[PDB]
């Protein structure tokens, strides 16, 4: 009583989920220091 383990299990019934389904939510957090960028997309570096 008044002493509960603070964790619970979701479950995700196989097909009973309309808003009750596993949604593997990957989140990208884009961190820039105005430093050397390092992860940037496929641009062709033309001459200067």
């Amino acid at each position, epitope marked *: 009583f008044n002493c509960y383990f603070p964790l619970q299990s979701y*479950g995700f019934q*196989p097909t009973n989920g309309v808003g*009750y389904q596993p949604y593997r939510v990957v989140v990208l957090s884009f961190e820039l220091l105005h430093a050397p960028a390092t992860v940037c997309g496929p641009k062709k570096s033309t001459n200067l």
Partner: antibody
Amino acid sequence: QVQLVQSGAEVKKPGASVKVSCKASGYTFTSYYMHWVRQAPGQGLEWMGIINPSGGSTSYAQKLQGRVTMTRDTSTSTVYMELSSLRSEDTAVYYCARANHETTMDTYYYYYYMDVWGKGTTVTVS
Amino acid sequence: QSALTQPASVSGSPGQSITISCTGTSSDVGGYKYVSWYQRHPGKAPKLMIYDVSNRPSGVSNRFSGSKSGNTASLTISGLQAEDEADYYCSSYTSSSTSVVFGGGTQLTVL
């Protein structure tokens, strides 16, 4: 009188397939799950997999690939248990088990509470 | 995971209290709150007394209590009798390949 009944015992030799039933009584057959536990000789109790009376969706233990297919009958409230390519250790007492909550929408309570039981049904394979 | 660890056999006396240990993995007992115990009267069916570690079905005598810490689950029988002599199996949900694990079992012999 909510009670679960399988068939009698079976006597198999290796490589066959076996048919185990389990009828239900005293409740709404489409609400709870049907869990299945055996007892290998000398080692403890062992769950296969389950089937939903609402839709028939199946699943089972990885160690039991292709050697098990669980079927059911809503009209007679009977659920059926299959085990092919039988081996010597398949000698076990096979139980049918009912989940301790009704299938509920948007649910939280987990559906592996094993609370309602069959008499038991021993398999003999040699 | 693998089968849980239970004592092979524990003896005692009527009215005295005996406790039964159940060790597993952090993925068997320590990650979850889902420990349930069972008993075997010889030649009979299982019977559930323990589930939700310390919670109970209706009709189980207040003599049996369950406890939880670390990798250890435990069952305590207060006010023992020859009425209590049976086999005892702890059960838990696992966060791995399987879903349910059982202990090796414990025979409680009343002397």
